[PDB]
């Protein structure tokens, strides 16, 4: 399922950003709440939009 792969990739980026001091845990938790909404909804494009926001975050922060 593409949705689960997009979500997994996003969760990995969040985990590394958190581990590396670049985001706070509240942001990661909000983002994971949104990603779980995307998983339940099952729309690949919305999940990919959240991943695009997370990758933009990583590029901006590192």
Asked if 14 contacts 23 with a C-beta cutoff of 8 angstroms, the reply is: yes
**In Å, what resolution does this model reach?**
2.2
Which residue matches tokens 């933009």? 56
Identify the three-state secondary structure at position 43: coil
Cα 59 from Cα 39, distance rounded (Å) = 24
Asked if 22 contacts 62 with a C-beta cutoff of 8 angstroms, the reply is: yes
Cα 10 from Cα 12, distance rounded (Å) = 5
Cα 27 from Cα 38, distance rounded (Å) = 16
């Amino acid at each position: 399922l593409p949705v689960e792969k997009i979500i997994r990739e996003a969760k990995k980026i969040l985990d590394e950003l958190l581990k590396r001091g670049l985001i706070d845990p509240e942001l990661a938790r909000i983002a994971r709440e949104v990603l779980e909404r995307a998983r339940k909804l099952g729309n690949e494009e919305a999940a990919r939009f959240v991943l695009e926001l997370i990758e933009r975050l990583r590029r901006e922060l590192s």
